[PDB]
Design a protein around this ligand. Structure first.
Ligand SMILES: CC(=O)N[C@@H]1[C@@H](O[C@@H]2OC(C(=O)O)=C[C@H](O)[C@H]2O)[C@@H](OS(=O)(=O)O)[C@@H](CO)O[C@H]1O
Length: 722
């Protein structure tokens, strides 16, 4: 019955597949078509055609493993896409049409139906599979009767009858929010359209509207740009992705139903884009510190994941108007064009998405200007993102506190992310591939960059924890200067350290004090563990003298500096130790498999060479202090360290501060309320984090109390001398 429901489904088909936009003469589209042709060909030649078959596909035969249901139905969706693509060799193919119909019936009779109960993961039963079934039926609605459609979607209503909750049939349902809430729309709104059920459509859309509300606690988007999911996990880059990616797909359809969403309600999406997503995108890469356990997926490295966000933004731009549309187009354009490592089209999986991107890139009317400098203090999720446009580098600071979980290990994914939030830092430079090409399965998980840890063995079976202290946070002064601290205690309460960071425009100072260890394990801070490029080798200098690193760790006592020299200055990394320090370095090939950190991944061996720099802490009360200076050549680095000779103001158990004389900026962390006199110019009076700038006789102050998550009146925390 061709009606308004089918009309909406046609629009949905144009969004999830886009066959109406296909053009064989379009190289990028032809590439995706060829991929789908191959997938269908593989599925058709391996499917079971035997009577009394115990499965459709032998590699997805054990139906007690929920993942096999979703994978099976997704193969049918691929078939539906091609059978309805005039340019496919499978267009209106009678064998494929019958294969999809027969397969749906077979699964319905022996594997997935209303009489079944969740076996394995609820996600496959309520989201993964229902979405694959909805899309298959939507694409091939001209081959199924309304009665068959309702028949094959009854199971969806059994497992997901309530648009406000998931796991309804289990003994522990949960309130649907964020990404999950968006998926609820792709499940019940589409099923509602297929079943011509107005009540399901309306109630689901109404439920979906909750997603536009910013929160001040719990899961969701925060005013400061943070995004929390799974109770207390920083998750903008994975569940946030699903949210914007899926919602941007749904909106065009929803807005054409009898229950469109108010325009002022959808206004918050622009806040997510500018405040939440944009800062986490550097040279086409979505910062891993925001991706949770997804970092352990080989097919979802940083640049790939970024496309999920970018395509979502582009769709939103397409449904926007005027300046709003123009600026969003420019944002997507400059990000994509800044990415010289990853081909955006590799993750644009529908013809409309491919088409939109091509028009954007070729439209001279859409400005593509390098993004300006910025610094986002995502205090509500304990992460900080910094980007310097003049020099061209990004910096990510990954922390956690009593308010957030350090790392997520679940569904057998991210088994070794133990220290990824223990004050771990990321540097985004000229090597756009650094955190890609197998970084995650080859990086030594015991030496994450920036972290202070003991060398005790850790179990893959462990799960995340919150930090005992709430004294973790960032005080931002402007787009280039901020200060952060973390009152760190390790996983088993055997080591402590007051770790602080001083972001000073074109460099970051790392200070650590009060380092104590009550265990028999050795303690050390990993200054860096950088993945190398065989094509661009580094020439290493210690105290400005070339050094030859080996697989075997070499000690360098009385080190004032270390410089990693590339042929490309935008890949250079220098480390200046305020006080001569005893460090050790090594360059070695590290091997591993994605399966080591994610059970469902390939056991194929991967290898990468890493340069590791560490500083041992053999005594209680130890400390570390150094300045990370990227993107400058050797002579310039040498000149800068002389300018910074006296930049360290203090680094003890109650006070840590660094001064940038060139900028007239101070970064300060106070652990108590004593009166601290700084540079004989002013005094800071309260426990907390400060970033201060002197402009003549004037003083600009940025104070933050991380525990109460509040700033304070200037006179309460600052006092100029005389
Ligand atoms: C955010 C997240 O990790 N969600 C998990 C699922 O992963 C997303 O799957 C899809 C999709 O449209 O199916 C798009 C995203 O890129 C993925 O991040 C999925 O995990 S997995 O199978 O991809 O490894 C399901 C499986 O049960 O679990 C979700 O939590």
């Amino acid at each position: 019955v061709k009606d308004t429901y089918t009309d909406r489904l046609d629009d949905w088909n144009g969004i999830i597949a886009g066959n109406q936009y296909y053009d064989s003469k379009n190289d990028q589209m032809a590439k995706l078509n060829q991929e789908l042709e191959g997938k269908v060909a593989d599925s058709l030649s391996s499917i079971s055609s035997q009577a009394d078959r115990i499965y459709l596909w032998e590699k997805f035969s054990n139906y007690k493993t929920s993942a096999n249901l979703t994978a099976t139905y997704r193969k049918l969706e691929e078939m539906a896409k091609q059978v309805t693509n005039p340019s496919s060799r499978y267009y209106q193919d009678e064998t494929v049409v019958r294969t999809v119909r027969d397969s749906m019936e077979w699964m319905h009779k022996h594997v997935y139906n209303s009489e079944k109960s969740i076996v394995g993961n609820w996600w496959d039963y309520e989201i993964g599979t229902p979405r694959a079934i909805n899309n298959t039926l939507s694409l091939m609605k001209e081959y199924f009767s309304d009665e068959e459609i309702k028949k094959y979607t009854d199971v969806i209503e059994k497992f997901v009858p309530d648009p406000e909750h998931f796991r309804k049939t289990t003994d522990n349902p949960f309130k649907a929010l964020g990404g999950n809430l968006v998926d609820m729309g792709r499940v019940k709104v589409i099923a509602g359209l297929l079943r011509k059920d107005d009540q399901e459509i309306s109630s689901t859309i109404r439920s979906i509207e909750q997603v536009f509300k910013l929160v001040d606690q719990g899961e969701g988007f925060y005013q400061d740009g943070s995004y929390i999911d799974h109770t207390n996990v920083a998750y903008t880059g994975a569940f946030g992705n699903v949210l914007i990616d899926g919602l941007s797909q749904l909106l065009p359809v929803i807005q054409k139903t009898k229950n469109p969403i108010d325009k002022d309600k959808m206004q918050t999406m622009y806040h997510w884009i500018d405040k939440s997503f944009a800062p986490l995108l550097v040279n086409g890469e979505l910062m891993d510190m925001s991706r949770g356990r997804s970092i352990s997926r080989a097919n979802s490295e940083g640049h790939v994941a970024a496309v999920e966000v970018l395509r979502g933004i582009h769709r939103i731009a397409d449904m926007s108007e005027g300046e709003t549309k123009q600026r969003l187009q420019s944002l997507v354009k400059t990000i994509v064009q800044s990415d010289s490592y990853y081909d955006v089209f590799k993750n644009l999986k529908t013809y409309k998405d491919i088409s939109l991107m091509q028009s954007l890139l070729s439209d001279a009317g859409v400005a593509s200007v390098p993004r300006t400098s910025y610094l986002s203090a995502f205090n509500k999720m304990d992460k900080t993102a910094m980007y310097n446009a003049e020099k061209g580098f990004g910096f990510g600071l990954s922390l956690f506190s009593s308010r957030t979980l350090n790392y997520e290990h679940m569904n057998k994914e991210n088994k070794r992310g133990w220290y990824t939030s223990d004050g771990m830092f990321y540097l985004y430079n000229g090597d756009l591939s650094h955190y890609s090409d197998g970084y995650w399965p080859t990086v030594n998980p015991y030496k994450m960059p920036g972290t202070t840890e003991t060398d005790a063995k850790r179990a893959d079976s462990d799960t995340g924890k919150v930090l005992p202290s709430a004294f973790v946070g960032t005080s931002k002064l402007d787009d280039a200067n901020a200060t952060a601290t973390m009152d760190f205690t390790n996983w088993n309460q055997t080591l402590t350290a007051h770790k602080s960071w001083f972001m000073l425009k074109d460099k970051i100072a790392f200070l650590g004090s009060n380092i104590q260890n009550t265990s028999t394990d050795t303690a050390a801070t990993t200054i860096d563990q950088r993945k190398l490029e065989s094509s661009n080798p580094y020439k290493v200098y210690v105290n400005d003298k070339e050094a030859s690193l080996t697989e075997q760790e070499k000690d360098y006592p009385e080190t004032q500096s270390v410089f990693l020299e590339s042929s490309d200055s935008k890949k250079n990394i220098g480390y200046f130790f305020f006080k001569k320090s005893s460090i050790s370095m090594s360059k070695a090939l590290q091997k591993g498999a994605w399966k080591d950190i994610n059970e469902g991944q390939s056991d194929k061996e991967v290898e990468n060479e890493f340069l590791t720099i560490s500083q041992a802490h053999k005594q209680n009360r130890d400390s570390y202090g150094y300045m990370l200076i990227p993107n400058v050549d050797r002579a310039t680095f040498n000149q800068m360290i002389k300018e910074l000779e006296s930049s360290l103001i203090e680094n003890n158990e109650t006070l840590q501060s660094v001064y940038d004389a060139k900028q007239g900026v101070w970064g300060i962390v106070k652990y108590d309320d004593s009166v601290s006199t700084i540079s004989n110019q002013f005094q800071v009076l309260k426990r907390g984090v400060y970033t201060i700038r002197k402009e003549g006789d004037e003083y600009k102050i940025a104070y933050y109390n991380p525990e109460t998550q509040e700033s304070a009146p200037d006179q309460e925390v600052f006092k100029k001398l005389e």
